[model samples]
Target chain A: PPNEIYATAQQKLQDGNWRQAITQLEALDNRYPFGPYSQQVQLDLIYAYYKNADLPLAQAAIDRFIRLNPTHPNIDYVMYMRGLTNMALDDSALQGFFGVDRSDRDPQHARAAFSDFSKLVRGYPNSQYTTDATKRLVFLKDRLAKYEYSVAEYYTERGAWVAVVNRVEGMLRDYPDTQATRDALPLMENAYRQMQMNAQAEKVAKIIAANSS
Target chain B: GDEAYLEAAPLAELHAPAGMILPVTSGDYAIPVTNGSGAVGKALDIRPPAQPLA
Candidate 1:
C-alpha cells in the first residue's frame, strides 16, 4: 500500500508536478509511519519542495532527514541542501537590505553572504560540494575585502586619514590576499603621508612597491 | 657567412654509427632499451614556498 503511494508520488515528480507529488508523499508518510519507504519518501519530498521553489519547506525536510538519518551514507547531500537554503535566505535578506538600485554596489551584503558560505566550508570540508564551495568561498572573501576597502574610502572622503589607516589595517589582517588590500596599500600610504607620519608612510610605500614587483 | 646553406639526409641513408648502437635507431632493441631507461626516471620533486616576515 505504501509502496504504491510512493510510486505514484515518484511518477508525479517525474512529470514535473512537484506540488501534487508533495501531497501524495505527505499522505504516504501519514498512512505508514514505520513503512519501508519512509526514508525514501522523506528524501523525495525534500527534492519536491526544492523543485517547487518552497525552499523553507525543503530546509525543514532536510532538517528532519538529518535528525532521522544522522549517519546516512549520503549525509553530504543533506548538508549541501542546508547550505543552499542558508545561501538563498542570506541573498534575499541582503537584497532587501540595500534595495534595488545599489544592491550590486553594497559590500555589506557580500560580507554577510560570505559569512554564510564560510560556515558551509568549515562545517563540511569533505563534502562532495567542497571543490565548487571552495572556489565560491575565495570569491566571497575577495568581495568582503572590497567591502572593507569601500568603508575605508568612505572615511577617507571625510579627510579621516587616521580612520582610513585603521580600516586598511583591519582589511589587511582579515583579507590579505584580496585586490582591495592591494588597492588600499597605496591609499593608506598617501593617507599616512598626509598626516606627516613619514616612517609609516615609507613602510606602506615599500609594501606597495613589493606587491607591484 | 651571412647566407645559410641547407643539407638533408635521406630517410634510408640516415644510419646509426656502426659500432655505437644508438638506442633510438628504431626496432625491437631500441623500443625495449628506451622503455627500460625511462622506467628509472625522476620520481619526486617538491619544494615549499618561502615564508613571509611578520
Candidate 2:
C-alpha cells in the first residue's frame, strides 16, 4: 500500500503537481509511519512543500526529519535543504511587498540558515553540499554584520555612547573580516570620544590608519 | 557569484573638486529634545523580532 502511494507521489512530483504530491506523501507518511520509504517520503514532502511555497511546512518537516533521523545517510542533503529553506524564509515575499530592505529588518531565519549551514559544514565536511553552504555562510555573515552595524549606527544617532561602544566592539570581534566591521571602525572611534575615552579613541584611530592602505 | 560579498578593499577617500567647498559641520538646525530618558538606546527595545519557529 505504501509502495503504491509512494509511486503515485513520485509521479506527481515528476509531473510538477506539488500539491497533489504533498497529499500522497502525507498519506504515505501517516499510514506507514515506519515504512521502508518513510525517510524518502519525508524528503519528497520537504521538496513538495518548498515547491508549493509552503515554507513554514517545509521547515517543520525538515526539523522533524532531522530530530528523528540525525544520522540518516541523506542528512547532509536534508541539512542543505534546511539551509536553503531558511534562506528562502529569511527573505520572505512579505518583506518586498512591504517595500523594505532585508538587512533593515530582523534576521531570524537568516540566523537559522546560518546555524543549519554551520552544522552541515562542521558535521559533514565531505558533504556534497559543503561548497554551496560555504558560499551561503559568507553572505549570511555579511548580512548579520550589516544588521549589527545598522543597530550600532542607531545607537550613535541617539548619542548612546556606551551602547555604541559595546555594539561596535562586538561587531569587530564577531565579524572582523566583514565590510560592516570596516565601516564600524570610525563609529567606534566616535563613540569612544563621545564617552571621553580619549585613549581608546586614539587606539581605534591608529587601527583605522593602519588599515587605510 | 559569491566573490562580490567577500571582504572588500577600502575605497579611496573623497576629495573636493577645484574651488568647491565641502561643509565641515552639520546643519545648524535645532534637534528635538526627549521629555525623559535614562539613555536613549537603553530606553528602547532594540532587539530583533522573535523567531518564527522554536
Candidate 3:
C-alpha cells in the first residue's frame, strides 16, 4: 500500500502545518528507514524540523543524513541544507528589525555554516546549490572576520595592548586579504600605538598603506 | 540499506557521554566522544573573560 501517512505529511507541509508534518515525517523515518521514500522522508523531516523551529533536531537530522548517505546522489542538497540550518542557529529576526549587531556575538554557528558551505563548494562545484552556497560562504566569511576583529577591538578597549596586538595579528593571519582584515590593520596599529610602541605601530601602518596602494 | 537506516538513528538521536575518548557504539553508529569539544550540540565558548586573550 502507498504510505498514507507520508502523503498526508506532504499535504500538511504544503499547507504549512509544520508540526503535523514533523510528526508524520518522524514516524515514517522510524518505521520505513529503508523504504523507497525513506531517504527523502528523512530529508523532509530535517526541513520539517527546521520549519517547525526545532533547530537542534534539524542539525542532528543533517548530521545523520551526511553520515549515513555520504554517497547519496542528493547528498549535495542535504549538505546545502546543513549550512542553512547552522546559519539559522545564530540568525535573529530581531537583529534585522532592532539593528542589533551580531558581528560581536558568538561565531560558533557562523563558523559551522561557513565550513558547510565551503565543503559544498569544493566538493560539488557543479551542483545547483553550489552557487547559492558560495554566496552564503562569502557572507559568513565577512561575519567571521568581523567577529575576530570585534574581539580585537574589545581587547583594545580593555587596554590589553599586548593581547590586542596578538589578537589582531591572528585575525590578519587567519582572514588575510578580506574586507574584514582591512578593518584589522587599523586596530593592530592602534594597539601598538596604545602601548607607545611607535616602531611597531609604524610597521603595521606601513603594511596597511602598502595594501591600500 | 537496513543498517544504513538504523545507523542514522544514533547519528541523530545519540550523544557521546562526557569524559570519553573512544567511539561509543549505539544502535549502528559509533559516535566519537571528545568530552565537550566535539560537534554534538556544543559550541565554542565565546568571550569567557577569564581566559587570556593572548
Per lDDT, the best of the predicted structures is 2
Which parts of model 2 are misplaced by more than 4 Å? A97-100, B1-54
TM-score of model 2 (CA atoms) = 0.75
Q: CA RMSD for every model?
A: 21.3, 15.3, 17.0
Steric clash pairs (candidate 3): none
Candidate number of the best TM-score: 2
Compose the digit string of candidate 2's lDDT tens values, residues A80-159.
77877777766557666786657857788777776667677777666555555564566787777789889988988888
**DockQ, in order, for the candidates?**
0.01, 0.03, 0.02
Model 1: per-residue lDDT, tens digit, A65-177? 77766777645555655554544544344555575422236554445445444555566655445554444454455545666777777877788887988887776556555
lDDT of 2 by residue, B1-54 (tens): 113323434323333333333232232111122222222211322221222435
The docking category that best describes candidate 3 is incorrect
Reference-based lDDT, residue A10, model 3: 56
For each model, chain A TM-score?
0.73, 0.90, 0.87
Cα-based lDDT at residue A54, candidate 3? 80
Q: For every model shown, what is its TM-score relative to the native structure?
A: 0.61, 0.75, 0.72
